[PDB]
Scaffold this motif. Structure first.
Motif, mmCIF file in Angstrom:
data_model
loop_
_atom_site.group_PDB
_atom_site.id
_atom_site.type_symbol
_atom_site.label_atom_id
_atom_site.label_comp_id
_atom_site.label_asym_id
_atom_site.label_seq_id
_atom_site.Cartn_x
_atom_site.Cartn_y
_atom_site.Cartn_z
ATOM 1 N N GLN B 150 0.805 -1.210 0.000
ATOM 2 C CA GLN B 150 0.000 0.000 0.000
ATOM 3 C C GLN B 150 0.844 1.269 0.000
ATOM 4 O O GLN B 150 0.281 2.369 0.038
ATOM 5 N N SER B 151 2.167 1.152 -0.084
ATOM 6 C CA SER B 151 2.983 2.340 -0.244
ATOM 7 C C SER B 151 2.804 2.916 -1.652
ATOM 8 O O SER B 151 2.123 2.351 -2.514
ATOM 9 N N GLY B 152 3.419 4.063 -1.875
ATOM 10 C CA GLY B 152 3.348 4.749 -3.140
ATOM 11 C C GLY B 152 2.522 6.019 -3.066
ATOM 12 O O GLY B 152 2.249 6.569 -1.991
ATOM 13 N N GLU B 153 2.084 6.465 -4.239
ATOM 14 C CA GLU B 153 1.429 7.755 -4.403
ATOM 15 C C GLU B 153 -0.080 7.585 -4.508
ATOM 16 O O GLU B 153 -0.573 6.807 -5.331
ATOM 17 N N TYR B 154 -0.802 8.328 -3.683
ATOM 18 C CA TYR B 154 -2.251 8.408 -3.738
ATOM 19 C C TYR B 154 -2.642 9.748 -4.343
ATOM 20 O O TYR B 154 -2.081 10.792 -3.985
ATOM 21 N N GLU B 155 -3.573 9.706 -5.284
ATOM 22 C CA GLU B 155 -3.913 10.852 -6.110
ATOM 23 C C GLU B 155 -5.318 11.317 -5.776
ATOM 24 O O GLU B 155 -6.277 10.551 -5.915
ATOM 25 N N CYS B 156 -5.432 12.571 -5.356
ATOM 26 C CA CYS B 156 -6.716 13.209 -5.127
ATOM 27 C C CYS B 156 -7.133 13.962 -6.385
ATOM 28 O O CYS B 156 -6.334 14.713 -6.964
ATOM 29 N N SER B 157 -8.377 13.738 -6.811
ATOM 30 C CA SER B 157 -8.957 14.373 -7.991
ATOM 31 C C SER B 157 -10.299 14.987 -7.611
ATOM 32 O O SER B 157 -11.229 14.265 -7.229
ATOM 33 N N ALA B 158 -10.396 16.315 -7.709
ATOM 34 C CA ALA B 158 -11.612 17.049 -7.382
ATOM 35 C C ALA B 158 -12.231 17.584 -8.665
ATOM 36 O O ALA B 158 -11.567 18.299 -9.426
ATOM 37 N N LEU B 159 -13.498 17.240 -8.901
ATOM 38 C CA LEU B 159 -14.190 17.670 -10.106
ATOM 39 C C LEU B 159 -15.590 18.158 -9.766
ATOM 40 O O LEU B 159 -16.212 17.704 -8.800
ATOM 41 N N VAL B 170 -0.013 12.595 -2.895
ATOM 42 C CA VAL B 170 0.676 12.455 -1.616
ATOM 43 C C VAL B 170 1.327 11.077 -1.586
ATOM 44 O O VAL B 170 0.781 10.112 -2.130
ATOM 45 N N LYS B 171 2.505 10.985 -0.970
ATOM 46 C CA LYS B 171 3.317 9.771 -0.981
ATOM 47 C C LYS B 171 3.351 9.146 0.410
ATOM 48 O O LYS B 171 3.858 9.757 1.364
ATOM 49 N N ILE B 172 2.804 7.935 0.522
ATOM 50 C CA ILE B 172 2.964 7.108 1.715
ATOM 51 C C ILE B 172 4.127 6.156 1.474
ATOM 52 O O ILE B 172 4.123 5.400 0.499
ATOM 53 N N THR B 173 5.134 6.194 2.337
ATOM 54 C CA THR B 173 6.185 5.186 2.314
ATOM 55 C C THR B 173 6.073 4.362 3.587
ATOM 56 O O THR B 173 6.122 4.912 4.696
ATOM 57 N N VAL B 174 5.915 3.048 3.421
ATOM 58 C CA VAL B 174 5.707 2.126 4.529
ATOM 59 C C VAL B 174 7.035 1.471 4.871
ATOM 60 O O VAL B 174 7.725 0.943 3.991
#
Ligand SMILES: *[C@@H]1O[C@H](CO)[C@@H](O[C@@H]2O[C@H](CO)[C@@H](O[C@@H]3O[C@H](CO)[C@@H](O)[C@H](O)[C@@H]3O)[C@H](O)[C@H]2NC(C)=O)[C@H](O)[C@H]1NC(C)=O
Ligand SMILES: *[C@@H]1O[C@H](CO)[C@@H](O[C@@H]2O[C@H](CO)[C@@H](O[C@@H]3O[C@H](CO)[C@@H](O)[C@H](O)[C@@H]3O)[C@H](O)[C@H]2NC(C)=O)[C@H](O)[C@H]1NC(C)=O
Ligand SMILES: *[C@@H]1O[C@H](CO)[C@@H](O)[C@H](O)[C@H]1NC(C)=O
Ligand SMILES: *[C@@H]1O[C@H](CO)[C@@H](O)[C@H](O)[C@H]1NC(C)=O
Ligand SMILES: *[C@@H]1O[C@H](CO)[C@@H](O)[C@H](O)[C@H]1NC(C)=O
Ligand SMILES: *[C@@H]1O[C@H](CO)[C@@H](O)[C@H](O)[C@H]1NC(C)=O
Lengths: 274, 273
Positions: B150-159, B170-174
């Motif tokens: 589940q590490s890596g980059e999570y992308e928020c998209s607002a429309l 945002v980058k979560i590194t586990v």
């Protein structure tokens, strides 16, 4: 303030105090321009201008109508920003009873519902008052269950909205109840004199009376006596009393929902102790 | 329709059709008079008049602002009664991410909360997407028992379906303890440079240590060179002898665990299967 309140048919005055140096000024009825400076937009002769000075911009709606109730705005333009000031014209109407329950007769013990619907501005409140032995209710509906005879009479609906006098109007409940004897004296008479028995019943509708001796009815046409009836009261008259006429007589009061009787004595005079 | 919808920064055109013999005409902004006939009440240079004919009275608010959104009325006076006609100015704004969660390192198994707050007209909806996968469709993305995958980059998209949607990541590194991911044996002819090597998979990177019979080998020792890249580590022999053939242990360590494997430096000879 927010409220300008005027009684219907009088004149409402809409004054706009102007503290800031104002370039343009207007009085609006909702989103319709009524007066802009000295330029009257409205064609209503009721709307007239009263004051047009740099400190005050004031018009008047004379003979105000219910249809006038609503928001009136003093909109202006200054050399910096536009400004407004909203006021609500509230039209007041004296209260009036529209429909009212009509007079009723009802039998004792049944239910009665009286209804008093009224109008006015603002919406009026209503009170019922029994006019005998009394605030019975304070609602359009007055509901009475198991109506007693003492609950007859006039009930008065009074609708008020704090504008002019309240409107009052009345309705009459008449309660039917079976008769009861309310007067029944004995009478003593010396033989050969005029002897008068009499009863009095209390009933709605009035009771009719009948006279009996030993459970056999007496008619008017008979010799030596006469039956006379009034309201509630009845009298059995002996014109020439004999020793046979002495005894017990029953007066029977009857009406459409019951009967009653009492017995009274035609007796001879004499001394009595205790 | 009653609604005039304009993108913020564009020009709104307020046209009033007049199907009546009108004596007076005005454009109102709520209860404020903007234009009355040819008499401009507003002092805003954005408000300009466009059409003033007996059939049409039309103005324009150029470079529209959100503060312009509201009811605009074409108020008139006829020979009989006053008449009005409201139109609603609706201002639309592309969506924009304001604040977003900043990058984190967290240990395996703990919790992570990402938050994506955005604005726009009308109010935007938001979706999170793992880039290594729609995980959530809310401002808050909550992850419990975070695994290493589940590490890596999570992308928020607002429309809000006006202009482009706004994206930010945002980058979560586990962090997780190491495990050996490469460890082949190597054969070498006596007298030649022989290379043993291991590779661990760890976050943060693992440091390696080399053992023989549960005794550490040092780098400075003659004949052997230990060289560490990121994941990888190599134990080098420059002159092999019969004493050197045997089993060697790779010990990978990081701040939350250790592991090891064993690999053989072996001598030539026949073998069957
Ligand atoms: C302030 O604005 C209100 C809202 O437009 C005006 O109300 C309107 O008033 C007129 C009469 O004054 C109403 O029209 C007609 O009245 C006659 C009675 O002669 C009747 O035959 C028609 O059926 C009709 O009612 C009209 O209904 C009413 N419109 C609304 C929406 O309420 C008012 O006149 C304005 N007052 C001032 C001082 O400017
Ligand atoms: C139509 O009417 C509305 C109000 O009835 C006008 O709204 C006002 O618009 C101005 C700017 O267009 C606002 O002033 C600004 O305030 C902000 C801070 O809030 C400040 O940063 C700016 O320097 C500027 O002074 C004003 O606050 C706003 N008032 C309200 C109650 O919304 C609108 O401009 C009118 N549109 C037209 C004439 O096209
Ligand atoms: C009078 O009332 C009693 C009941 O209390 C009844 O017995 C009697 O018959 C009645 N007399 C007459 C004449 O009805
Ligand atoms: C006769 O009259 C007296 C006086 O009311 C009463 O006490 C008595 O019971 C009566 N008897 C009959 C049969 O009416
Ligand atoms: C390697 O792993 C085993 C148990 O997993 C352990 O007994 C041994 O001590 C570890 N370390 C080395 C240097 O072999
Ligand atoms: C040593 O090497 C042999 C050959 O693969 C292997 O079977 C054995 O498990 C190893 N023992 C240790 C302690 O590494």
């Amino acid at each position: 303030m927010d409220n300008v309140t005027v009684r219907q048919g009088e004149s409402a005055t809409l004054r706009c105090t102007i503290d800031d140096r104002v370039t343009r000024v207007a009085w609006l009825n909702r989103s319709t321009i009524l007066y802009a400076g000295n330029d009257k937009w409205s064609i209503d002769p009721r709307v007239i201008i009263l004051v047009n000075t740099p400190t005050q911009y004031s018009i008047m709606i004379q003979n105000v109508d219910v249809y006038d109730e609503g928001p009136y705005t003093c909109s202006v333009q200054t050399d910096n920003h536009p400004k407004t000031s909203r006021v609500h014209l509230i039209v007041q109407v004296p209260p009036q009873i529209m429909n009212i329950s009509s007079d009723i007769t009802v039998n004792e013990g049944s239910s009665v519902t009286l209804l008093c619907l009224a109008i006015g501005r603002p919406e009026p409140t209503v009170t019922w008052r029994h006019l005998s032995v009394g605030f019975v209710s304070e609602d359009e509906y007055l509901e009475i269950s198991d109506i007693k005879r003492d609950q007859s009479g006039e009930y008065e609906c009074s609708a008020l909205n704090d504008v002019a006098a309240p409107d009052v109007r009345k309705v009459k409940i008449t309660v039917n109840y079976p008769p009861y004897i309310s007067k029944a004296k004995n009478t003593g008479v010396s033989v050969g004199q005029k002897g008068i028995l009499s009863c009095e019943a209390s009933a709605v509708p009035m009771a009719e009376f009948q006279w009996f001796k030993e459970e056999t009815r007496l008619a008017t046409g008979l010799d030596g006596m006469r039956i006379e009836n009034k309201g509630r009261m009845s009298t059995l008259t002996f014109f020439n009393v004999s020793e046979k006429d002495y005894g017990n007589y029953t007066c029977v009061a009857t009406n459409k929902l019951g009967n009653t009787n009492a017995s009274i004595t035609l007796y001879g005079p004499g001394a009595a102790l205790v």
